[PDB]
Write a structure and sequence with these properties.
This is part of a larger assembly, with two copies of chain A (about 400 residues). With about 400 residues, chain A is α+β, with helices and mostly antiparallel strands. Chain A has six helices and 23 strands. In chain A, α3 runs antiparallel to α4, α3 packs parallel to α5 and α4 packs parallel to α6. Chain A starts with about 20 loop residues before the first strand and ends with a helix. Chains A and B meet through β16, β19, β20, α2 and α4 of A and β11, β12 and β16 of B. Chains A, B: One of its GO terms (biological process) is mitotic cell cycle. Chains A, B: Keywords: Acetylation, DNA-binding, Isopeptide bond, Nucleus, Phosphoprotein, Repeat, Ubl conjugation, WD repeat. Chains A, B: Trimer. Interacts with the polymerase alpha catalytic subunit POLA1. Interacts with MCM10. Interacts with DNA2. Interacts with CDC45 and GINS2 subunit of GINS complex; these interactions associate WDHD1 with the CMG helicase complex.
Chain lengths: ~400, ~400
């Protein structure tokens, strides 16, 4: 019969393993942090993508840091439990307006920190004792709550938290994972209450986080990048297959950051290792989205993939409009126009294939000006029944528009 | 130590496995499909309960399209992966008005199909990539999204679609299944989120599907039939046990359909087998429901569940009316009268039994006009001490509404 597996360890996104003497602490869009320690000294280095917020700086390792995260306004540094010394967290609010420039938190004995994250004016940290705690960047503490299982990792953006934990045990190479989404809004909420996390068969989760536009995403060992489509009842859709971008087994990609719209998948191809070498530091490459649809080699398949890309390229922007955060309107304009153009090309090729059912099925999603243009496409080559039924669709939708 | 069980293999509802050369492949509410295979040749046969939909048809292909489904709009087919090719998915739009009668698509490298299903215009297939693919019958690719484990079966009706997959594995004869349910409307939703599937102890999932009105239903290997009560917070309610019917003359009852007006479960009786053989043509058996309400016998227990079976089915009709779908107003009108007269008879029974609190608490479940009728019944039976506080509760209901 099946054999139970050992449990894979927790991780912090951007933190390379501690067994290497010289290591990266965290990669962020705001900046990058590095660390070194050996038989006689220990040190931290921090640099920013834009030094107007703060100058690049060298920091010393007093609390034996192992975990980190960065924001536009503050930096968190934290560590795991230890018998002779407490687990601790240290926040450096470098952009502080007053004497709140830094503060420290030292946990109860045998309580740890395994993951932390930052957001808009708040900070968060969680322990392997199945609970999470919240803080504010000026130093006031916030609510505490407990987690459904052994916590693996967590991240956040704006005023929203993504948590990943172990919900059970896997068998014959499988791993058992679940996921939480929490909201720190005006009325705090939990839109996803502990569902099983989709993951490729016999894979291991490799990286979690958010795109710069504030929607959650992740990737596992088999390289299927996934993102939370809210238009599908908050369901995980694949968005890239980076093993196809790899040259072979020698390669694996380490994500530095993601931008949904404009499109940039920023990552480093690591050679012969699960993480980049700390020196000579590699350069970050930009990859592009590619969906696991069928008949990818066909041009119709390509425009189908582009349509289902473009709809989600504006769904998350509308979600930002609802929750109140800012976005650049050109992103919405380009996505919302290109989806109409792409599905109109789909409808035109369907009409040239004289599949009236396919034409109506595509026209069901369209705006009425495009339905009129589809009726004119049907009038070309004298497809009277297709034109009549598209007109019926137009009338039926106008009865409610 | 404790023994983990193997995961049960995938299955397509309304089918017989490959133990028989000319096995059943589909039996749905409007048609039947058969699958043929031998040492050198293979074929498929198509039938409808009325030839006005489409006449009997014979198909054959080099690939065994081992998976199929049937609907009033089209027939759906799919084949397994091979050493030479990956899987393909196929559609027969027999109900079309023109020459769009057929469609074919081939899936990416190394991919295989476990189960497929149909809906109102939509179609779907679970894949070995831990991805669900969704289409139209006209061949438009809808959303592709991720799943947490191997899918064991699939089903659909209207816009509501049913997925069941292994959450983990069971121990000592049991298995750990879980259920995820979507409704693919214009503002589509998730009804179940991979929650564990209730099943009888030491049993497996023998059949899934929908009742004719569109409620989700399934049956376990022990013969327990159960369905989703969406009105009661989306809870699974058992309705019947098939094995005991007809003094257990059949080894099993292979269900083919369910309907609420008249109350019917239509099945095939199976001798010495879990499933029926294809030949000679079987005789259909129709059974009444048997709710698991306690102290059932002597016609006083049975009237309680005769009340409750009504709402157990008819919570769905309120949904189907308020969402804009067509529904059976005859069933609505009849059930809302049956409930009140049955409650009045129960109130008379409890008054005859001098258990006046039962009369009061049935009156709480009445409607307002039926509360006034309860006052009249209590007056006719000269039980004024009951009628007093009954009138008090009537005034309270009138205050509420």
């Amino acid at each position: 019969g099946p054999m139970p597996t050992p449990r894979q360890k927790p991780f912090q996104s951007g933190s390379t393993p501690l067994h290497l003497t010289h290591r990266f602490m965290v990669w962020n869009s705001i900046g990058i942090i590095r660390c070194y320690n050996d038989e006689q000294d220990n040190a931290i280095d921090v640099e920013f993508h834009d030094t107007s917020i703060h100058h690049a700086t060298h920091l010393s390792n007093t609390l034996n840091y192992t975990i980190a995260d960065l924001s536009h306004e503050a930096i968190l540094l934290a560590c795991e439990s230890t018998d002779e010394l407490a687990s601790k967290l240290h926040c450096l609010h470098f952009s502080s307006w007053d004497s709140s420039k830094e503060w420290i938190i030292d946990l109860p004995q045998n309580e740890d920190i395994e993951a932390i994250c930052l957001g808009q004016g708040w900070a968060a940290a969680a322990t392997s004792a199945l609970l999470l705690r919240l803080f504010t960047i000026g130093g006031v503490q916030k609510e505490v709550f407990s987690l459904a299982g052994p916590v693996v990792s967590m991240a956040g953006h704006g005023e929203q938290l993504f948590i990943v934990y172990h919900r059970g045990t896997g068998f014959d190479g499988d791993q058992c994972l679940g996921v939480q989404l929490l909201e720190l809004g005006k009325k705090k909420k939990q839109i996803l209450h502990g569902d099983p996390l989709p993951l490729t068969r016999k894979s291991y989760l490799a990286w979690i986080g958010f795109s710069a536009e504030g929607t959650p995403c992740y990737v596992d060992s088999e390289g299927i990048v996934r993102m939370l489509n809210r238009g599908l009842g908050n369901t995980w859709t694949p968005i890239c297959n980076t093993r196809e971008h790899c040259k072979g087994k020698s390669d694996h990609y380490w994500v530095v950051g993601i931008h949904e719209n404009p499109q940039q998948l920023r990552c480093i191809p690591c050679k012969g290792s699960r993480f980049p070498p700390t020196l000579p530091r590699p350069a970050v490459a930009i990859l592009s989205f590619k969906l696991p649809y069928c008949q990818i080699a066909t041009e119709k398949g390509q425009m189908e993939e582009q349509f289902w890309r473009s709809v989600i390229f504006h769904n998350h922007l509308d979600y930002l409009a609802k929750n109140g955060y800012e976005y650049e309107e050109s992103t919405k304009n380009q996505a919302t126009k290109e989806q109409q153009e792409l599905l109109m090309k789909m409808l035109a090729l369907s009409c040239k294939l004289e599949r009236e059912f396919r034409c109506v099925e595509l026209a069901d999603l369209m705006t009425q000006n495009a339905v009129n243009l589809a009726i004119k496409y049907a009038s070309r080559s004298r497809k009277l029944i297709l034109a009549q039924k598209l007109s019926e669709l137009a009338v039926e939708k106008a009865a409610e528009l």
